[PDB]
């Protein structure tokens, strides 16, 4: 079994350039987009066929209305923050909320905000308190903490509602979200410079994107170069890990994916 997650992001931009939406909301299950809304379409829409097939029109109609409300609230919140900081011109405001359902059935829930892409306010649903990065965040923290009913609302949403939505969507998208595409893994020798050979352990075609790749000696090798886990464009991912050789040890690439362990020893 593996962790699954539901996340909703918001981006507000004040005085956006022509085109740039004032407001965007996108939902994700794991790495997959499931929902989109923005200030231009003013519609909440599925971003996955399995969300479209399983949620009737009245779902999208209702969340369309909620998102129009949240869009307006977001615009006011940013305008107020800009006033507090005495900032003119275009600034950004972001929110992320979500939950994880782990293997054991244990859960996490989180809610935070950024201003100009930097941490502003982080929720602690166990102490029912907000971490504020500066004086202006502390001012917002005070207002929010004085509303015990809203904090309790937030705790409940993160712990019960967010998890119930995640399980509903995981079932809808089961064939996409809970499948395994095992990696195709190979080892390349490359002379990177005269008399210097590097070994590349390369993986592609794998889903989910979480993967562990390391190099071992006969012990884990030090100074291992890592490639990012990158989307291949077909719903699968690719990644690599390299070492440079000294001009006698035996080296082996170790890869773990979705509960399968593989070793490529290079002779």
């Amino acid at each position, epitope marked *: 079994m593996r962790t699954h997650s539901l996340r909703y992001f918001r981006l507000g931009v004040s005085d956006p350039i022509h085109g740039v939406p004032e407001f965007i909301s996108v939902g994700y299950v794991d790495s997959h987009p499931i929902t989109t809304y923005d200030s231009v379409t003013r519609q909440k829409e599925p971003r996955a066929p399995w969300m479209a097939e399983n949620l009737a029109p009245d779902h999208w109609e*209702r969340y369309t209305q*909620l998102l129009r409300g949240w869009q307006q609230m977001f615009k006011v919140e940013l305008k107020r923050l800009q006033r507090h900081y005495n900032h003119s011109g275009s600034h950004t405001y972001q929110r992320m909320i979500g939950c994880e359902l782990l293997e054991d059935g244990s859960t996490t829930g989180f809610l935070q905000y950024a201003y100009d892409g930097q941490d502003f306010l982080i929720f602690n649903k166990d102490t029912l308190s907000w971490l504020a990065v500066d004086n202006v965040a502390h001012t917002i923290k005070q207002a929010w903490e004085a509303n015990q009913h809203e904090l309790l609302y937030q705790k*409940n949403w993160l712990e019960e509602e967010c998890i119930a939505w995640l399980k509903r969507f995981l079932e809808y998208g089961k064939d996409t979200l809970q499948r395994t595409e095992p990696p195709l893994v190979r080892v390349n020798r490359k002379e990177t410079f005269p008399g210097v050979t590097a070994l590349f352990c390369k993986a592609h075609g794998f889903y989910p994107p979480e993967i562990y790749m390391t190099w071992m000696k006969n012990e884990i090798v030090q100074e291992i170069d890592y490639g990012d886990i990158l989307p291949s464009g077909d719903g699968t991912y690719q990644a690599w890990a390299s070492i440079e050789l000294d001009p006698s040890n035996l080296y082996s690439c170790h890869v773990e994916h979705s509960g399968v362990h593989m070793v490529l020893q290079v002779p």
Partner: antibody
Amino acid sequence: GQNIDQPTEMTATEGAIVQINCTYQTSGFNGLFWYQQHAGEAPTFLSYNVLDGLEEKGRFSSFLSRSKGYSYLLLKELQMKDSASYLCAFLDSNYQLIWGAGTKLIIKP
Amino acid sequence: NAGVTQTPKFQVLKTGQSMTLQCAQDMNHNYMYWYRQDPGMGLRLIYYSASEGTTDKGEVPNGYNVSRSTTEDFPLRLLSAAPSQTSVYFCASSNREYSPLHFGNGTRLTVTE
């Protein structure tokens, strides 16, 4: 957001105690509210519960059992001015506000 | 702040007449609501507005319309008065979809042939 039930009417004596019960069935829950409505007047906010347990302010308490789908509004030291309809309501997963038919509380002097 | 101002408090109409119930709030609330209250049932949502510039049907929208061109105002329009519309109407506002409703003082409305 399926169903909500509360008794049509209750009668209690001045100086005593009344527990108004409200049961609800839903898959999805964002909190349960009590409002007070005096005859000919607007409903006014009394209470909000969303976690299990008991909140008290003055002569009024509100309890919520999530597992039983059960709330009560408890009025202590009843006064004639407590004569009123008490409306139970809950928020479903989509913030649909689902209203009980109300309990008319009659206080005997 | 005055809270929610709803007018008129009482109205009689002949079958076929149209009527606008006014509702305004000075609390900067995003949400406004129209309910009818009838004996032996819970408040029934006619229409709501999540924000200035949007509106949506409640549970019993038929025979009514609304507009929300401002934050402050949520007028309810009875298109063609019918006896089934004899009721008490309450306007409400809330800061958010999950916060407490503030109600206007209501409109007792009777429609006679």
